[PDB]
Every structure is written in C-alpha cells, then in structure tokens.
Amino acid sequence: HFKEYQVIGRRLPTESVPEPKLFRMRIFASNEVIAKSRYWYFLQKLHKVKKASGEIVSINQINEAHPTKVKNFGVWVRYDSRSGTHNMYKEIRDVSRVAAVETLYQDMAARHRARFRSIHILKVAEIEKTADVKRQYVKQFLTKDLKFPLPHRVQKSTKTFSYKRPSTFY
Amino acid sequence: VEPVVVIDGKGHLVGRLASVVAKQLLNGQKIVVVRAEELNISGEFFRNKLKYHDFLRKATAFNKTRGPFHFRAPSRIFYKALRGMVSHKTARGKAALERLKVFEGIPPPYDKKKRVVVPQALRVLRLKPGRKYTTLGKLSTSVGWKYEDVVAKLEAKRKVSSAEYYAKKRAFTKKVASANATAAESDVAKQLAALGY
Amino acid sequence: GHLGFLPRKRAASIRARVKAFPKDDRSKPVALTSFLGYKAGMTTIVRDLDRPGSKFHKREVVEAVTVVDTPPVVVVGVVGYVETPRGLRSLTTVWAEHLSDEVKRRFYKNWYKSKKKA
Amino acid sequence: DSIVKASNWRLVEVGRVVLIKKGQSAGKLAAIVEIIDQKKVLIDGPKAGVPRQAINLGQVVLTPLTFALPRGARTATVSKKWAAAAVCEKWAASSWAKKIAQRERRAALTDFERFQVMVLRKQKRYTVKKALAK
Amino acid sequence: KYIQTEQQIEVPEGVTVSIKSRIVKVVGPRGTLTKNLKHIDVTFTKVNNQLIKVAVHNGGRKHVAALRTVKSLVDNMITGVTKGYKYKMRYVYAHFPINVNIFIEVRNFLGDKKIRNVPVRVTIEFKDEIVLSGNSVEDVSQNAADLQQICRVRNKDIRKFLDGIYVSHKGFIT
RNA sequence: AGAACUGGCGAUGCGGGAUGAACCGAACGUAGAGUUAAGGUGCCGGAAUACACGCUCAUCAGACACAAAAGGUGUUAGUUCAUCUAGACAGCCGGACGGUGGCCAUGGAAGUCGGAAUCCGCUAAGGAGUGUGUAACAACUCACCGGCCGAAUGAACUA
RNA sequence: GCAGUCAAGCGCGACAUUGCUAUACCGAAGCAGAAUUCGGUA
RNA sequence: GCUCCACACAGAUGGAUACGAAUAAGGCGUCCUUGUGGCGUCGCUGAACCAUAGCAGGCUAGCAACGGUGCACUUGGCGGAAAGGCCUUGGGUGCUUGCUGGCGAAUUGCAAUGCGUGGGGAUAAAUCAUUUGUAUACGACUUAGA
Structure with missing residues (x-):
C-alpha cells in the first residue's frame, strides 16, 4: 500500500547563505525510508544537491482531504525505459490520491513495463468539472444514468465436487 | 464423503479435470468419469489436431509396437492425459490408477446413479467468453475414432x-x-x- | 514386395475368416451374401468379347479359369449382433434342434474315442 | 407481437443494494453510491454498519432489490433514503434473507435442540405419510 | 474498452419478431425465417415492441464487430421476409448454345460433354437470362455463386473466352 | 596465441536448480522442538486452481543474447501537429467553366501515345489536368467546393 | 570491392544510385488454339 | 463337472440421494388463444434431502393410526452399452421412537477398535500313439479309426 509523504531539504546551511531555497516536493512511498531515498534521488537528478551536503528538515505524511469522495485525477509522469526518457500524462478516476498513484504504478508496470525504480510523479491534480477530461475511457464513466450488468460472474467453489451444475447468471 | 464419485465429463477441461481426478486418486478416492467424448480442450480445433500428430510422429524405428502407442478413443486420450500426472511405474501410482474408470457416454449401472461435476474444471467457468475451444469427441473422430x-x-x-x-x-x-x-x-x-x- | 501384406507370418487358422460383409439394404428382401466352397482344378476357357469398340469386339478370346467345389450349404442357426461403443457384440445365439454328423464331428478332436456327446 | 425472454440482469447502478461477500463487513448489506470504474464502486451501508468506502466488485455480490438514490449521496442522505425505501423489509421477506437466517439458526442449534428437531421431524413425517395415499 | 454499445433494429407493423436465447425468428407476409446466433454472444431487448436493441457490455473492437454485424444480419432477414430478394444471371455463348434444365443442369457449355449440375438449396423462374428468388439472401446468393463458379474455363485465355453464366442483376422481388 | 594483478576451486560434504565445474544460499559431532535462505506452492512434488491491476491467440506462442534493421487492414497504452457547432471523418447528389483544341509535335492525338512553361477572368469550386477509355473527339472521375448529413476526426511519431 | 550524392536518426548512418570487372491442382502473361514461361500446394 | 473318505479356517461400518439443455440463460407451479406463449416463484453452492431415541440397541402393558418399514412368497412391467438391477398387484409374518407406562444396565472399577486341499468310485473332454496330406529342416497344422 502506497503512502504520500512531504520532504523538504535545505542543503545544510553554511555561512553567508542562511535558510537556502528549501526545496519542497511530495513523494509517494510505502515507508519513510523509501520516501527519503526517493527524495534524495530526485534532488540529485533534477537539482545539484546530494546527500553529502544535504539534510532532511522534516518528513510528514499527508492524508487525503476526502477519502470518501470520488475524483478524477490528472497525473503528469516522467519515466525511463529501454528507450530514452519522455514525459507522460494520464487521467485516473479514483477516490484518493494514494489509490490513483498506486493504479498508475500498476498500469505502468503492466503496459509500459516501467516499475517504481524508473517512474517519477511530477504532479497530481484533481479535475473539477466535466468536459475537461481528455481521455475517452475516463469520459466513459461520466455519462448520466450509467447502468451496466456484470455478465458471466466467476463464482468461487469451496468444494471439489458440486452436484448443481452452477450457472454464471448475475 | 462418497464411496464412489461419478463425474460428468461433459463441458469440462481435460487438464484441470485430469489433475483433480489424479489428486483425488492419490488420496484414496474412487472416481468414475463419464461422457469423455464431450470433454473440451481450450484452443481452436486445428491447433489440437496439429498437437496430436506431433506426439504420434515419434514412432520408434526398430519396434513401433513396443514403442509409443496411439489410442483414438476419447477415454483413452483422457487416461493418457491423467496417466502422466500420476507417478506411474511405481506400486503407489499403479494402485491409484486402479480406482479410476473412464467410459464414453454413461454406460449402466452408472446411468441410474447420481453424477457430479467439478466447478473448477468447467469450460464455461474458466475459459474467457467468446474464445475458441475444441471438443474431444470431434478430435477423436478426426484422428481415427469410429464410434x-x-x-x-x-x-x-x-x-x-x-x-x-x-x-x-x-x-x-x-x-x-x-x-x-x-x-x-x-x-x-x-x-x-x-x-x- | 507389398507392405500391406506384411508381416509375412504363417496364418493361424486354415479357414480364412471374412473381415467385412456387404452393406445392408433396408428395402431389399432377405437374401444371402456369402457362400463357401473348395478349390478344385484349373482349365482353359474361350469366348467371344462383346465389349464395345474392343480389339476383340465380336471375336474370340481365350484365357484361364478355375473351378471351385460348391456343395449346397445347410444352415444351423442364426447369430445376432448389437451396436456397442467397443464394437459389435453377440448377445444371444440359437441353434437348430438337429445337427448333421459332420457338424457334431467339427466340435471334436478325438471323435472316435469321445463319447459323441453332442 | 414481439417476444424477448430471459434478459433479466441485476444491473449495477446508483441505489443498488448489495450484500458484501468478503471483508470485515461480510454478510452486511450496502448501497452503491457512485461507480468509480469497471472494478471499483463506492458503497455506503450506514444502516447496516459498514463504513463508507470504495470496495471491489469482486468482494461484493449484487441483489435484485433496488431503490432510488441521488448520485454521490453522503452518509446522511444515503441513510435517509434507505429508511424511506424500507429496503430492509423487502430484504427479510425475500427467500434469500430467509435462507441466510435459516442457515444461521441451524449453525446455532444445540444437541438437545437437535434431538427436539429430530423428534418433531419424525412426527411430521408420520403425519405426512398418514396423509399420503389418502 | 466500451462499457455498453447498442444497435437498433426496426420492426415494421407487417412483421413479428420472437426472440429467445440467441436463436432468432422472423415472421412476415412472405413466410418465416430463423437463424442461430448462439456463437455471437449478444443480448436483445424489447424496448417499445416496435424496435429491437442488440447490445454488448464490456466488449472491445473484436466483440463490437459482431455487435454491429448482428444488426446487419437482422436487417437483411427482415428485408427478405418483408420483400424478398431476386437474383439474375446472363447466358453468353459464342458458338456452342447453352441449354439449362431444372437441381440445375448446364449442358453444351463450350462444347463440354460433361453436364455440370448445381443443387438447389430459392426458386427458379424466367431473353437468355435466369431469375432466382428466395426469402433467404444467403441461399439464393450461394446458388448463384455456385452456378457462376461451375463454368470454369480451365487452361484457356480469360479475356478471349467469355462463355459462361455470371451474376447480372440484384434486387427485391417486390 | 603469450604475459601482469586480482575473487572461488582445489583438501568439500548439504539444500535449490528435470542432472550437472564455473549458478544462489549455506561450509558439517550424535539427537528432540521451533524459525528460515536460495528455490517453490495444478499432479508427479511437501506448499494458495490466493488476491488486484493490464497485457497475448501465436498454423509449431509463451514459460529458454547473437540472426532483430525493418514489415503486419493484429491488439492495448502514450507524444508532436492539422481540422473542429464559422458544422469534425465518412456516405450519396450537384458544380467541376471561359482564350483553349495554349506552344511544338499531326495521317489522327482536343488535359491524360509525346517535349518544354505552367496565365489571366472568375467563383463557394476548375491541375492548360490524378486516373479509366477511343486512331481523335465522346463518357465517368479526384483535388477543389456547395447541398443532404451531426462530434469529435485526421497525419506523423513513442511504449 | 573501390571512389561520390545521399540522410529517419545518432563527424557516423536506411531504399535507390554514378565509372571498371517428375505427376497432379490453382493464380499471372498479347494465353487467338496448341505449345510455353513465372508463382504456390506437395 | 458328480460321489465316499483324512485334514483348515491401497482399506465397508449412514445413504455413489439417477433428466436433458443454455451459461449474453435457466428451471418449478399455475393459466389460457395452445405459443421461441402470460403471471408468480428459486438460485448467489450439497451449510442441501431421507434417516438418525431402544442391553452394538432387550422384555413387557396400553392409546391412536391401519399408515411407514425388514422378511421369504406371490401377479405383472421395465432394464443388452458393461442388460444382472429397478420396481409392481395380493396376502402372511415381525418392528414401529406416532403417543403413554413398568422392568435391566453397575464390578469392563477414569481410556488402549470391541470356507479347499489329497486318496479313491463312476464320466465329459484333451495330448501322444497310430495314420492322410492341404503343412513340413526340426517345431507346428488340417485329417481317420468302439
């Protein structure tokens, strides 16, 4: 289960430079250690700050404001694969940011074969109104009075032998 | 749970059904399989037909009879499929196979007795909807079955x-x-x- | 030679056994299909060929033939066969009240010393 | 004159009361509020007790009963609509809830209660056999 | 992935459609036509007794193809039942006259002694032209195709030789 | 092929890997109970026909880095541009002209057997012509617009 | 092979390109018929 | 196979409890114009149905039903795929826990579940012997003789 963390670093302030830029970003990780490692990697890559002169001011966990509210999430993702790195944008209809990022990671590992090692979450934002969604598969669930069945349900059997010839009707 | 279990093989997967029957046999359960000709195998018919040819093409040169044996009856095919899943050439394996009987259709007195099905081996429960599948009876008729x-x-x-x-x-x-x-x-x-x- | 006539092993039974019979007809009346006989001798035969447009059309032609002894055949019983998945099976057989002496002897290998309990 | 038979499906939609098969709230009724995707649906069962959450359709089984419900209703509105529709009364009358209750009662039976059930069954069988063939 | 895609079929007052499991039946003035679609995996609904919907749920392009072709097949069946279909073929010969006798037998085609026969699966009526009419489009069309395909000019120049029978006109009986 | 430095072997059993010298863990008294590594959990084989998200019909798939640069009207996801309620793509109907049959080439070739430029007048729209076709005209036409049509469509790239 | 123009991309680099040195059954051909040629199954 | 004599004794313990067909559909009841018909009703597992009380299951007296059930008979039907089993009419004989009473349990001491051979009598058949070839190196095979 993923979790959202906030990490800030200001590169061990020295003489003549008190309170540096104080780089701030949000990191999604399953634990504090992984969040700190990802923050260090992002600082090394995007910025010129390394752990040699770095410092973790504070790490905090951010909880989604409305864990029971359905939202459409627009995520900008930059990931690396066998080919060169390129930007990517996707839209996810989920309830919480953590679930949306988890689904994005699962899709990337499934379709693009990209795993957590080479995936960067640039930004996660909520789409407020309809007709701003640019993906058809997300617009699919926005239709008014959406009703559909669940044909051919895969019923589970607790016994090897069943004297019923079960039907998959729903 | 039952001294003898009669399994209706119609609309069932050969692989899963054979595996479960062999596992039950290794547990000391007597099982009788009926309607073997109605057994189904995943995939289009041509693929199954091609697969059968490549296992019988290996006829031994010096002694074909003492070598591979090619049986056309659907019950024989099912037994061969289940035979490989059991540790044959051993007393434990040989004894287990004695508890299994395979017949085409439902010969008596099994026709007058209750029969069961294996939910995990049903073709209509495992295969994805709309996918091609092969029938054991048709394959047996194509490869030489005449009954x-x-x-x-x-x-x-x-x-x-x-x-x-x-x-x-x-x-x-x-x-x-x-x-x-x-x-x-x-x-x-x-x-x-x-x-x- | 001919692979279809192999392996070249000695026949187990002196009397050849018919492997197939003519297809049954559901409309024609009951009639026989096969007969038994004994080969006996060989001789030459001549005739005129009426085959149209032939090299010997309406003209003599010669060849060789054989003669088979075919004494009248007497029935002894009727055999019924049923259709089963494992093949044709004989369920019941009924024999005639009386049988010829040769038929009774056929069921014996020491007929002279046996009690002739046919 | 037209005929279209055997096309009754339990559609998944807002206001579709469902029964949870697996999870903490297994065996507790829930009402679908908003559909997230083909595999995720938001449910709320405040009358039953299950807290509002997004559940996987594989962990829940739909039920024939249905009731009107505004899309994306909150817990209070969902509970109000549940009370107004009186879906609980319909649920009990159905043979499915009766079967659940009978199974629970049988699982809760005692040895002495089992003996009493056996005696009553014997008496009922005797009465039925006497009635039969007459 | 499409959550639900549906296609509509019209039901004229002169015909009645009875729908059960995928087998489909149509009744009208010209007769009754039935077909089996148990391998197409589609569902039907009675929306207003005058229109028939065919829909597929959670089906992709592969399933959408069958979803759409179901409407085409049903429309073809309805049109055949209401009005029927007519097919025609032309007789062309250079030197050897072509004689056709109704099973349909073709004689003296390109001086060929062999008589080509095409079984009749559809009716035959009559210029030097044949007329084929039948409630089922598939039957008449296949009969015409077989009639055209038996007159194969083997080991001959395609352009120089034109003898044979070919489909010429298509339309409704009405 | 021959040399310089460096980690295992060699003197070495055990589990895993269909078996295994260059592979992983683990380096050893005889026993009982318990917890693990690599390796595994449909049967042979002791262990879930576990969960969740997507992918693939393969007529020799798949579960093992060279031949791999490219091809496919096979499928699921992304990037850059164009059109877009001043009417998106598509399907039908209509217009699709005048000097003119441009100049040369002429047995006849008028846009389409050939060679060289490609204009004005225009109209919402005409290449002195993208094709079928006649020894030449004839007839249809796409590209170019309009009308009936009603929402997203098209071109090129990446996974 | 040598030497030059290329240039989707990464001074190297794609398709073109300039000087020497059996039988039988199907699809196409200007197949008029026969005969013949090219491709496929085997 | 018939008869007389001598001798030995891979795994039950409730019931394998019978349609078919579809699985993008099905059963059950009922109704009518008799149809790919109308209404109700059910699945979402067999967690199901019968039977399950009596010194390992005795003795005995009544009530109410006259039904349920074991037994050998008895009339008849069905089952040829491996039928070999399924029943069905009539009576007889036992139980009936369907209902109400009277007798025994103990000491077992706190548990080690609790049906052919070998010797004869007779009689069906086979081998060799013998002998013909239709088979033949030898095996082997087709024949004849109370």
Missing part, C-alpha cells in the same frame, strides 16, 4: 426414458409438496420452523 455415431445414437436413448423418469419424479414431488403444504401451520410444523426446520 462417435454409435456413441451419439445410444446416448440419445439414454436421455430417452430418463426424461420420463424425471417427469415421474416431478409428479411425485408435486404430491410431496402438496402433503407438506397441507401439513404446514401445525404445532409440530410451527415448532420445526422456530427451530430452523
């Missing part, structure tokens, strides 16, 4: 008079339900209902 006509002819007779037996059972259950209904609302019936019966 499909008689099998179907005497299986149709099996449904004949068994529909009549079911009709008689339904008529009897009509009177049984009427007797239960007229016996309802009584003190004993009310007590049974309160006690979950």
Whole structure:
C-alpha cells in the first residue's frame, strides 16, 4: 500500500547563505525510508544537491482531504525505459490520491513495463468539472444514468465436487 | 464423503479435470468419469489436431509396437492425459490408477446413479467468453475414432426414458409438496420452523 | 514386395475368416451374401468379347479359369449382433434342434474315442 | 407481437443494494453510491454498519432489490433514503434473507435442540405419510 | 474498452419478431425465417415492441464487430421476409448454345460433354437470362455463386473466352 | 596465441536448480522442538486452481543474447501537429467553366501515345489536368467546393 | 570491392544510385488454339 | 463337472440421494388463444434431502393410526452399452421412537477398535500313439479309426 509523504531539504546551511531555497516536493512511498531515498534521488537528478551536503528538515505524511469522495485525477509522469526518457500524462478516476498513484504504478508496470525504480510523479491534480477530461475511457464513466450488468460472474467453489451444475447468471 | 464419485465429463477441461481426478486418486478416492467424448480442450480445433500428430510422429524405428502407442478413443486420450500426472511405474501410482474408470457416454449401472461435476474444471467457468475451444469427441473422430455415431445414437436413448423418469419424479414431488403444504401451520410444523426446520 | 501384406507370418487358422460383409439394404428382401466352397482344378476357357469398340469386339478370346467345389450349404442357426461403443457384440445365439454328423464331428478332436456327446 | 425472454440482469447502478461477500463487513448489506470504474464502486451501508468506502466488485455480490438514490449521496442522505425505501423489509421477506437466517439458526442449534428437531421431524413425517395415499 | 454499445433494429407493423436465447425468428407476409446466433454472444431487448436493441457490455473492437454485424444480419432477414430478394444471371455463348434444365443442369457449355449440375438449396423462374428468388439472401446468393463458379474455363485465355453464366442483376422481388 | 594483478576451486560434504565445474544460499559431532535462505506452492512434488491491476491467440506462442534493421487492414497504452457547432471523418447528389483544341509535335492525338512553361477572368469550386477509355473527339472521375448529413476526426511519431 | 550524392536518426548512418570487372491442382502473361514461361500446394 | 473318505479356517461400518439443455440463460407451479406463449416463484453452492431415541440397541402393558418399514412368497412391467438391477398387484409374518407406562444396565472399577486341499468310485473332454496330406529342416497344422 502506497503512502504520500512531504520532504523538504535545505542543503545544510553554511555561512553567508542562511535558510537556502528549501526545496519542497511530495513523494509517494510505502515507508519513510523509501520516501527519503526517493527524495534524495530526485534532488540529485533534477537539482545539484546530494546527500553529502544535504539534510532532511522534516518528513510528514499527508492524508487525503476526502477519502470518501470520488475524483478524477490528472497525473503528469516522467519515466525511463529501454528507450530514452519522455514525459507522460494520464487521467485516473479514483477516490484518493494514494489509490490513483498506486493504479498508475500498476498500469505502468503492466503496459509500459516501467516499475517504481524508473517512474517519477511530477504532479497530481484533481479535475473539477466535466468536459475537461481528455481521455475517452475516463469520459466513459461520466455519462448520466450509467447502468451496466456484470455478465458471466466467476463464482468461487469451496468444494471439489458440486452436484448443481452452477450457472454464471448475475 | 462418497464411496464412489461419478463425474460428468461433459463441458469440462481435460487438464484441470485430469489433475483433480489424479489428486483425488492419490488420496484414496474412487472416481468414475463419464461422457469423455464431450470433454473440451481450450484452443481452436486445428491447433489440437496439429498437437496430436506431433506426439504420434515419434514412432520408434526398430519396434513401433513396443514403442509409443496411439489410442483414438476419447477415454483413452483422457487416461493418457491423467496417466502422466500420476507417478506411474511405481506400486503407489499403479494402485491409484486402479480406482479410476473412464467410459464414453454413461454406460449402466452408472446411468441410474447420481453424477457430479467439478466447478473448477468447467469450460464455461474458466475459459474467457467468446474464445475458441475444441471438443474431444470431434478430435477423436478426426484422428481415427469410429464410434462417435454409435456413441451419439445410444446416448440419445439414454436421455430417452430418463426424461420420463424425471417427469415421474416431478409428479411425485408435486404430491410431496402438496402433503407438506397441507401439513404446514401445525404445532409440530410451527415448532420445526422456530427451530430452523 | 507389398507392405500391406506384411508381416509375412504363417496364418493361424486354415479357414480364412471374412473381415467385412456387404452393406445392408433396408428395402431389399432377405437374401444371402456369402457362400463357401473348395478349390478344385484349373482349365482353359474361350469366348467371344462383346465389349464395345474392343480389339476383340465380336471375336474370340481365350484365357484361364478355375473351378471351385460348391456343395449346397445347410444352415444351423442364426447369430445376432448389437451396436456397442467397443464394437459389435453377440448377445444371444440359437441353434437348430438337429445337427448333421459332420457338424457334431467339427466340435471334436478325438471323435472316435469321445463319447459323441453332442 | 414481439417476444424477448430471459434478459433479466441485476444491473449495477446508483441505489443498488448489495450484500458484501468478503471483508470485515461480510454478510452486511450496502448501497452503491457512485461507480468509480469497471472494478471499483463506492458503497455506503450506514444502516447496516459498514463504513463508507470504495470496495471491489469482486468482494461484493449484487441483489435484485433496488431503490432510488441521488448520485454521490453522503452518509446522511444515503441513510435517509434507505429508511424511506424500507429496503430492509423487502430484504427479510425475500427467500434469500430467509435462507441466510435459516442457515444461521441451524449453525446455532444445540444437541438437545437437535434431538427436539429430530423428534418433531419424525412426527411430521408420520403425519405426512398418514396423509399420503389418502 | 466500451462499457455498453447498442444497435437498433426496426420492426415494421407487417412483421413479428420472437426472440429467445440467441436463436432468432422472423415472421412476415412472405413466410418465416430463423437463424442461430448462439456463437455471437449478444443480448436483445424489447424496448417499445416496435424496435429491437442488440447490445454488448464490456466488449472491445473484436466483440463490437459482431455487435454491429448482428444488426446487419437482422436487417437483411427482415428485408427478405418483408420483400424478398431476386437474383439474375446472363447466358453468353459464342458458338456452342447453352441449354439449362431444372437441381440445375448446364449442358453444351463450350462444347463440354460433361453436364455440370448445381443443387438447389430459392426458386427458379424466367431473353437468355435466369431469375432466382428466395426469402433467404444467403441461399439464393450461394446458388448463384455456385452456378457462376461451375463454368470454369480451365487452361484457356480469360479475356478471349467469355462463355459462361455470371451474376447480372440484384434486387427485391417486390 | 603469450604475459601482469586480482575473487572461488582445489583438501568439500548439504539444500535449490528435470542432472550437472564455473549458478544462489549455506561450509558439517550424535539427537528432540521451533524459525528460515536460495528455490517453490495444478499432479508427479511437501506448499494458495490466493488476491488486484493490464497485457497475448501465436498454423509449431509463451514459460529458454547473437540472426532483430525493418514489415503486419493484429491488439492495448502514450507524444508532436492539422481540422473542429464559422458544422469534425465518412456516405450519396450537384458544380467541376471561359482564350483553349495554349506552344511544338499531326495521317489522327482536343488535359491524360509525346517535349518544354505552367496565365489571366472568375467563383463557394476548375491541375492548360490524378486516373479509366477511343486512331481523335465522346463518357465517368479526384483535388477543389456547395447541398443532404451531426462530434469529435485526421497525419506523423513513442511504449 | 573501390571512389561520390545521399540522410529517419545518432563527424557516423536506411531504399535507390554514378565509372571498371517428375505427376497432379490453382493464380499471372498479347494465353487467338496448341505449345510455353513465372508463382504456390506437395 | 458328480460321489465316499483324512485334514483348515491401497482399506465397508449412514445413504455413489439417477433428466436433458443454455451459461449474453435457466428451471418449478399455475393459466389460457395452445405459443421461441402470460403471471408468480428459486438460485448467489450439497451449510442441501431421507434417516438418525431402544442391553452394538432387550422384555413387557396400553392409546391412536391401519399408515411407514425388514422378511421369504406371490401377479405383472421395465432394464443388452458393461442388460444382472429397478420396481409392481395380493396376502402372511415381525418392528414401529406416532403417543403413554413398568422392568435391566453397575464390578469392563477414569481410556488402549470391541470356507479347499489329497486318496479313491463312476464320466465329459484333451495330448501322444497310430495314420492322410492341404503343412513340413526340426517345431507346428488340417485329417481317420468302439
């Protein structure tokens, strides 16, 4: 289960430079250690700050404001694969940011074969109104009075032998 | 749970059914398989037909008879599929195979006894909808089986008079339900209902 | 030679056994299909060929033939066969009340010393 | 004159009361509020007790009963609509809830209660057999 | 992935459609036509007794193809039942006259002694032209195709030789 | 092929890997109970026909880095541009002209057997012509617009 | 092979390109018939 | 195979409890114009149905039903795929816990579940012997003789 963390670093302030830029970003990780490692990697890559002169001011966990509210999430993702790195944008209809990022990671590992090692979450934002969604598969669930069945349900059997010839009707 | 289990092989996967039957056999359970010709295998017919040829093409040069044996009956094919899943060439494996019987259709006295199915081996429960599948009977007929006509002819007779037996059972259950209904609302019936019966 | 006639092993039974019979006809009346006989001798035969447009059309032609002894055949019983998945099976056989002496002998290997309990 | 038979499906939609098969709230009724995707649906069962959450359709089984419900209703509105529709009364009357209750009662039976049930069954069978063939 | 895609079929007052499991039946003035679609995996609904919907749920392009072709097949069946279909073929010969006798037998085609026969699966009526009419489009069309395909000019120049029978006109009986 | 430095072997059993010298863990008294590594959990084989998200019909798939640069009207996801309620793509109907049959080439070739430029007048729209076709005209036409049509469509790239 | 123009991309680099040195059954051909040629199954 | 004599004794313990067909559909009841018909009703596992009380299951007296059930008979039907089993009419004989009473349990001491051979009598058949070839190196095979 993923979790959202906030990490800030200001590169061990020295003489003549008190309170540096104080780089701030949000990191999604399953634990504090992984969040700190990802923050260090992002600082090394995007910025010129390394752990040699770095410092973790504070790490905090951010909880989604409305864990029971359905939202459409627009995520900008930059990931690396066998080919060169390129930007990517996707839209996810989920309830919480953590679930949306988890689904994005699962899709990337499934379709693009990209795993957590080479995936960067640039930004996660909520789409407020309809007709701003640019993906058809997300617009699919926005239709008014959406009703559909669940044909051919895969019923589970607790016994090897069943004297019923079960039907998959729903 | 049952001294002998009769499994209806119609609309079942050869692989899963054979695996479960072998596993039950290794546990000391007697199982009888019926309607082997109706067994189904995933994939289009040509793929299954091509697969059969490449296993019989390996006929030994010096001694073909003592070498691979190619059986066309669907029951023989099912037994071969299940045979490989059991540790044959050993006393434990040989004893287990003695508990399994495979027949085409439902020969008596099994025709007059209850039969069961394996939910995890049903073709209509595992295969994705709309996907191609192969029938064991048609494959056997293509590869040399010559008893499909008689099998179907005497299986149709099996449904004949068994529909009549079911009709008689339904008529009897009509009177049984009427007797239960007229016996309802009584003190004993009310007590049974309160006690979950 | 011919692989279809192999392996070249000695026949187990002196009397050849018919492997197939003519297809049954549901409309024609009951009639026989096969007969038994004994080969006996060989000789030459001549005739005129009426085959149209032939090299010997309406003209003599010669060849060789053989003669088979075919004494009248007497029935002894009727055999019924049923259709089963494992193949044709004989369910019941009924024999005639009386049988010829040769038929009784056929069921014996020491007929002279046996009690002739046919 | 047209005929279209055997096309009754339990559609998944807003206001579709469902029964949870697996999870903490297994065996507790829930009402679908908003559909997230083909595999995720938001449910709320405040009357039953299950807290509002997004559940996987594989962990829940639909039920024939249905009731009107505004899309994306909150817990209070969902509970109000549940009370107004009286879906609980319909649920009990159905043979499915009766079967669940009978199974629970049988699982809760005692040895002495089992003996009483056996005696009552014997008496009922005797009465039925006497009634039969007459 | 499409959550639900549906296609509509019209039901004229002169015909009646009875729908059960995928087997489909149509009744009209010209007769009754039935077909089996148990391998197409589609569902039907009675929306207003005058229009028939065919829909597929959670089906992709592969399933959408069958979803759409179901409407085409049903429309073809309805049109055949209401009005029927007519097919025509032309007789062309250079030197050897072509004689056709109704099973349909073709004689003296390109001086060929062999008589080509095409079984009749559809009716035959009559210029030097044949007329084929039948309630089922598939039957008449296949019969015409077989009639055209039996007159194969083997080991001959395609352009120089034109003898044979070919489909010429298509339309409704009405 | 021959040399310089460096980690295992060699003197070495055990589990895993269909078996295994260059592979992983683990380096060893005889026993009982318990917890693990690599390796595994449909049967042979002791262990879930576990969960969730997507992918693939393969007529020799798949579960093992060279031949791999490219091809496919096979499928699921992304990037850059164009059109877009001043009417998106598509399907039908209509217009699709005048000097003119441009100049040369002429047995006849008028846009389409050939060679060289490609204009004005225009109209919502005409290449002195993208094709079928006649020894030449004839007839249809796409590209170019309009009308009936009603929402997203098209071109090129990446996974 | 040598030497030059290329240039989707990464001074190297794609398709073109300039000087020497059996039988039988199907699809196409200007197949008029026969005969014949090219491709496929085997 | 018939008869007389001598001798030995891979795994039950409730019931394998019978339609078919579809699985993008099905059963059950009922109704009618008799149809790919109308209404109700059910699945979402067999967690199901029968039977399950009596010194390992005795003795005995009544009530109410006259039904349920074991037994050998008895009339008849069905089952040829491996039928070999399924029943069905009539009576007889036992139980009936369907209902109400009277007798025994103990000491077992706190548990080690609790049906052919070998010797004869007779009689069906086979081998060799013998002998013909239709088979033949030898095996082997087709024949004849109370």
